[PDB]
UniProtKB/Swiss-Prot annotation, chain A:
Subunit annotation: Belongs to the multisubunit FA complex composed of FANCA, FANCB, FANCC, FANCE, FANCF, FANCG, FANCL/PHF9 and FANCM. The complex is not found in FA patients.
Gene name, Swiss-Prot/TrEMBL: FANCB
The name this protein goes by in its record: Fanconi anemia group B protein
Reported function: DNA repair protein required for FANCD2 ubiquitination.
Stretch of the intact protein here: 418 to 683 of 859
The organism of origin for this protein: Homo sapiens (Human)
Subcellular locations according to the entry: Nucleus
UniProtKB/Swiss-Prot annotation, chain B:
Entry's localization field: Nucleus
Subunit (UniProt): Belongs to the multisubunit FA complex composed of FANCA, FANCB, FANCC, FANCE, FANCF, FANCG, FANCL/PHF9, FANCM, FAAP24 and FAAP100. Forms a subcomplex with FANCB and FANCL.
Coiled-coil stretches: none
Residue range from the parent sequence: 769 to 881 of 881
Highest taxon of source: Eukaryota
Entry function: Plays a role in Fanconi anemia-associated DNA damage response network. Regulates FANCD2 monoubiquitination and the stability of the FA core complex. Induces chromosomal instability as well as hypersensitivity to DNA cross-linking agents, when repressed.
Originating species: Homo sapiens (Human)
Protein name: Fanconi anemia core complex-associated protein 100
Gene symbol of the encoding locus: FAAP100
Length: 192, 113, 190, 273, 57
């Protein structure tokens, strides 16, 4: 009966998979959770976020939990063509490792902007993140530098593009052209 | 509150004001007592260089205070030498007993007359 | 250096109550995220003519519990510093810094904030260094830091904070590995 | 403290600076101790003129005297810095090359910038030596010879550049102090440690010194106070032979107040622990 | 469960006042360190009988 009535609860408030999947990465004292989207979900029309929600079974108290959200758009083999939109949350770790362990669950919230009715306030429950010192002691989600130079699980790239301090710039050389970039990048800086 | 105390003074119990504090944590008593005692230091050194002096009894109760302090003091000294010697169960009941002494002493502290 | 000398002279001499410059140290409760926290508003006041021009700095320093611990505390104290920059007559500034819980009500309470000022010429041109004037050395004791919600003016439903039942490290430790009221009083002459 | 040059900083901001004493015994096997002070700070917001000069200010305040009488300052140098200077290392610590620590200023700059946590360990019915194996064999520790009670963990993935200190007083009841680059690393260690330790090994977090020293603190403040009150009554007990001077009573109660403030302080330390 | 579903139904209804649970939010200036900051006090109030017990966030 109990089960029957939850499912009743869920058709009470209310098909197409609007989210790929959940994945999570540990950086240093930073939790980076992320998600791959689908073409269905239009970030043009839809302000979205992502929270983290702690299990009170573990957390006997109210510590508040804050999470920073990034939207990352990358073009895939540009030289239609696939863009990759990924959405990802960031927070502290030491506060969560209080019980040697914790199980957070993930919420992607969506809202429309066009309609001034606040009509379409959908969500998704986009999975659940189990973690512990037994897991971290064997790496598994960490990024520990140089051995993990050759980046081949792209979530590790996506973790670094979520965790890091982003800073955006224009360079204008108005009586030259500007090409030394690639040399400094490739030769001086030595970029793969 | 006001508490007049006749077996401190020889004639006149001045109606000396008592200040109390009650709490779960002994640590918060330690801090608030630290505060009030510092504040009474300030007040009494402020009133000294102006104020006169009332007489005391000189007898019975100051000796009472000496005796009940000297017993505790020699007991603390025996405890310090035991902690120096280091036989077994170095310091648990030692701390639990020292805090009993502390609570004992706190209840009357610095009846200023 | 003129303005310096005239000010230094005005402060230190005339051993009187009302000074030309002031550093008043208050305490507040403000509410963050979920916790309540202690603040020190240090309010600097210029009741004289002089105007502490430039190459003038203000060195506030917030000194904990004062005793010679064997091992160490992770933070002996903090100091902030601020350029004091035009600050003319009658003028003031107001600088709020926390003292408040170190992660888990972590608050040993004897605590002083001490203000100093600091002139140096080596700022503008030199030629033999700079100066430290003392100012207000106020201590915080428990009796400022206690708070009375039952008696309070509004009589509004404020939730009970109940400071954490354990240290994070302590809860962490126990997980990894598996009464009367205290009293003090005094008497004093009426 | 640290003090900007306004000649640089047109602009007024704050500047926080976080202080620390570090006591390190020198060749313990009189005996030279090393007391060093330091402050610690954000670079990032300084650099905004590619360059800055800071003056250092060491203030000395007296405790014993409630007169605030002795308020000495020292002006103990001046710092210049620039991205050129960093561009060429010179000051920076960037890891594994600066494993062999042979400029003790770099050790101390570590011991300041790190998150520290102090811990008591007691294996009551059992001697404790597996510490020395977990450090030297499992954790892969280098002793700094200069200061031979300090251990540098060099195990090469996500414990790299974390520091310990180990006093084994009364080989049952030792004390371990962990400087780490964040707290997660602290948790990975305490976890990894408790797995290796005995079953009776009772950890305890220390805020404010070891329990032995806080008992000594309490014992000292109370023994002094009880002697001072016996002194009150003995001063009265010579006035009896020769009714008491309320001025004498005042005089002795101020000395007693000065000891009571200390017993109160030592008691807040013990009643928390 | 029952209490939850009853509140949920109350919440999803447009009875023209958000009776069961409210959240008022509100704009404060404060001061930190040096700079005046903009703060949101977000106040959750239970007006109704229903107690939002454990399992809720």
């Amino acid at each position: 009966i109990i089960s029957k009535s939850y499912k009743a609860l869920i058709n009470l408030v209310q098909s197409e998979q609007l989210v790929e999947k959940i994945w999570y990465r540990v950086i240093d004292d930073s939790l980076v959770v992320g998600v791959k989207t689908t073409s269905s979900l239009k970030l043009s029309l839809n302000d979205v976020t992502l929270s983290l929600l702690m299990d009170q079974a573990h957390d006997s108290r109210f510590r508040l939990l804050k999470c920073q959200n990034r939207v990352i758009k990358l073009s895939t083999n540009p030289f239609k063509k696939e863009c990759v939109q990924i959405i990802t949350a960031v927070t502290s770790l030491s506060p969560l490792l209080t019980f040697s362990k914790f199980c957070c669950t993930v919420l992607l919230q969506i809202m429309e902007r066009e309609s001034g009715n606040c009509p379409k306030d959908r969500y998704v429950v986009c999975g659940r993140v189990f973690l512990s010192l037994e897991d971290l002691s064997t790496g598994k989600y960490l990024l520990t530098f140089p051995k993990k130079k050759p980046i081949e699980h792209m979530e590790d790239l996506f973790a670094l593009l979520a965790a890091f301090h982003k800073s955006c710039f224009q360079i204008t050389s108005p009586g030259y052209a500007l090409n030394s970039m690639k040399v400094w990048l490739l030769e001086h800086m030595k970029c793969e | 509150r006001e508490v007049a105390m006749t077996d401190l003074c020889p004639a006149g119990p001045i109606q000396a004001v008592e200040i109390q504090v009650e709490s779960s944590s002994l640590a918060d008593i330690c801090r608030a007592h630290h505060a009030v005692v510092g504040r009474m230091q300030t007040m009494v050194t402020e009133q000294a260089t102006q104020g006169s002096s009332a007489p005391d009894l000189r007898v019975q109760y100051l000796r009472q205070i000496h005796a009940n302090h000297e017993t505790l003091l020699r007991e603390v000294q025996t405890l310090r030498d035991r902690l120096c010697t280091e036989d077994e169960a170095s310091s648990c009941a030692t701390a639990q007993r020292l805090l009993q002494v502390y609570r004992q002493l706190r209840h009357p502290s610095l009846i200023l007359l | 250096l003129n303005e310096a000398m005239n000010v230094s002279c005005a402060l230190l001499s005339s051993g009187t109550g009302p000074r030309p410059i002031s550093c008043t140290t208050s305490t507040t409760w403000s509410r963050l995220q979920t916790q309540d926290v202690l603040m020190a508003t240090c309010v600097l006041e210029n009741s004289s003519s002089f105007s502490l021009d430039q190459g003038w700095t203000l060195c506030i320093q917030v000194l904990t519990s004062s005793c010679a611990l064997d091992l160490d505390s992770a933070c002996s104290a903090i100091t902030y510093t601020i350029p004091v920059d035009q600050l003319g007559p009658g003028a003031r500034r107001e600088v709020t810094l926390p003292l408040g819980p170190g992660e888990n009500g972590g608050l040993d309470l004897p605590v002083t904030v001490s203000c100093t000022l600091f002139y140096s010429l080596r700022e503008v041109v030199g030629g033999q260094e700079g100066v430290c004037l003392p100012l207000s050395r106020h201590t915080v004791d428990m009796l400022q830091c206690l708070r009375f919600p039952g008696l309070a003016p509004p009589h509004t439903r404020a939730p009970s904070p109940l400071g954490p039942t354990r240290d994070p490290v302590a809860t962490f430790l126990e997980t990894c590995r598996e009464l009367p009221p205290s009293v003090a009083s005094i008497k004093v002459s009426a | 403290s640290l003090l900007m040059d306004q000649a640089h900083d047109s602009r007024f901001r704050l500047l926080k600076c976080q202080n620390r004493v570090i006591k390190l015994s020198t060749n313990p096997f009189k005996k030279e101790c090393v007391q060093i002070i330091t402050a610690v700070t954000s670079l990032s917001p300084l650099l905004t003129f590619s360059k800055f000069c800071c003056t250092v200010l060491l203030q000395i305040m007296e405790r014993e005297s409630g007169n605030c009488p002795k308020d000495r300052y020292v002006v103990c140098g001046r710092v210049f810095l620039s991205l050129e200077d960093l561009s060429t290392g010179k000051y920076l610590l960037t890891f594994p090359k600066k494993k062999p620590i042979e400029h003790m200023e770099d050790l101390f700059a570590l011991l300041a910038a790190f998150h520290k946590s102090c811990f008591q360990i007691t294996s009551p019915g059992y001697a404790l030596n597996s510490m020395k194996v977990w450090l030297l064999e499992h954790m892969k520790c280098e002793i700094i010879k200069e200061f031979p009670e300090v251990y540098f963990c060099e195990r090469p993935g996500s414990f790299y550049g974390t520091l310990f200190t180990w006093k084994q007083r009364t080989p049952f009841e030792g004390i371990l102090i962990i400087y780490s680059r964040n707290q997660t690393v602290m948790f990975q260690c305490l976890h990894n440690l408790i797995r290796i330790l005995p079953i009776n090994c009772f950890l305890k977090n220390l805020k404010s010194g070891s329990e032995n020293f806080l008992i000594d603190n309490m014992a000292f403040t109370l023994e002094k106070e009880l002697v001072t009150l016996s002194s009150l009554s003995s001063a009265i007990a010579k006035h009896e032979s020769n009714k008491v001077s309320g001025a004498l009573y005042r005089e002795i109660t101020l000395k007693v107040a000065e000891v009571q403030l200390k017993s109160d302080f030592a008691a807040q330390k013990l009643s928390n622990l």
